[PDB]
Amino acid sequence: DVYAQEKQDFVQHFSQIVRVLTEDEHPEIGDAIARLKEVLEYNAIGGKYNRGLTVVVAFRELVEPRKQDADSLQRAWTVGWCVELLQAFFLVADDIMDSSLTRRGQICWYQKPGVGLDAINDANLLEACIYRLLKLYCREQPYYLNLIELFLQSSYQTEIGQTLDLLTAPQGNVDLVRFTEKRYKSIVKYKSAFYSFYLPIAAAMYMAGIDGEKEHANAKKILLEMGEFFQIQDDYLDLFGDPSVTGKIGTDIQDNKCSWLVVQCLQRATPEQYQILKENYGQKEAEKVARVKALYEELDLPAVFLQYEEDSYSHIMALIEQYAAPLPPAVFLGLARKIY
Template sequence: MKTVPELKALINGQIATLKSKKEPKNLYEPIHYVLSMGGKRIRPLLMLMTYELYKDSYSEVLPAAAAIEVYHNFTLLHDDLMDKSDLRRNKPTVHNVWNENTAILSGDTMLILSYHLLAKVPAEHLSKVLNEFNKATLEICEGQEYDIQFETRDNVKAEEYLDMIRLKTAVLLASSMRIGAVVAGASSKDADLLYKFGLNVGLAFQLQDDYLDVYGDPKVFGKNTGDDIATNKKTYMLIKACEKATGENKRLLNEWIHTAFFERQDKIKAVTAIYNELGIDKICKEKMDEYYNVAIEALSNVSVDSKLKEPLFKIAAELMNRNI
């Protein structure tokens, strides 16, 4: 079995093959720009780690791993455009370096390139892989639409939010693992268990993002904390606080949510104090643990030797211990 750095090198090498496309320059340069920003490569990494539970020859799965990463970065490119974000991984976003039309067209091209890579999967697995990929990509669009709707709704429920992050974030992790299992020839039962593992790790990971935006150390977390509070982003933390708040806490929380002019740090400090009083940090961590435990149980039931599963147990633990 290869180490994580070795697997990432394989992924990056496969992605680098896309750089042969250079013309028209304004179409392909933004794609190379986005893919060169780095990132954890967690989705293709999980695909390869799943694959090597059963096989150790990576050539038949590497194009699919690269396809998942290209697709993921396509979604980020279009997300940045929809959100009008200025930075991605501390670099200017594509629509700022080029323009909005270029961001749309280069993003569309990335989607097509991801299918081009997927088509290299061995023929006997291609139908299942495409069906899984199509299901995931459609669900991600559904999740994005729900996320957009939530921005203008004051009555979002926790269950709706959890379903949104399942669609928008967790399904791509889960599908990456199912595709790895399918290409490796795993049983349907194992493929389902690995999907369940990825889905629940993805849910726990996104909830941890909500938590760290309030309680994380910016030096460890990698970005400023409090942005979600400052922008009234509908996170699990805010939704649960709105559900639980009563009396003075409810009045203050509503006041901060609907106040147009405020000092950023004052709002973050005040809303965090309300979270603390309501025990929102504990509620969020309990939900994270719930998903994480389901993930670990699913992986435990996969029918391969326990030693082979150790890298997946380890990466799950690392994902859930960024700064808590």
């Protein structure tokens, strides 16, 4: 993959990211800078880096090789890491609010002895690092304000989606009537689709001088649909994924979430199955979670997911045929290969 090709340089740039972000160590703040380094090392490293790498890959595909000078590539890697940092900020807070146990194969940052709710400020620091890096590397570039505004808008969208996620999933209060297809789509559009797929491609676009509203709207048409599929896959894997592969233990059932699985359950369930779901959803008891999983297996939801992935793939490819131009289709095809 073009991603496998770009990764080494990308991952190697992290040591520079950390060095530059700890280099204004103002000796009086050194203890805080040491902490920031620990937060960065624990939370921004250990993933697949696909969102950050997308900035780098798309940049190479959209900027003419003659314009891909050493300093331009450095900026592209930096902006890719800003995308990973935004994700890091959101995940550290999300793990607290979802009462999660593990992430990327290790205990969630907030669960670490001695961290706890201090993680809230650590997450805010990750967010702050984005704008520090943008100033340090891109302040003199004509796309500087476009990138600042893109990251801020992306944060606002994600926060609105998180609000909807949490509102639809009140603890100890099970009302399955809330869990509709229309509600689901709205939640996932905001909480995941914007920052996961649109953000990195849009960043590369701005860096290539592609700032037109029409071009961004067309890219969105593809990328927001990709983001939706990806969140549906995340929901499926929450229950049916191998945590050795996913790196995280699922909490959606216990947490009373408007998951794609519960929505599809509700679409197919008989009145009797509905009551079983109602009596067992949103509760910490392992036996109750197990009855929900059994109901999902009884309704062939794994098979339903497999079909949906096939149909979604074909849909996004049709959307690439319609909306990719004038951008190289490879920009979208590479990302599609990576997520499906």
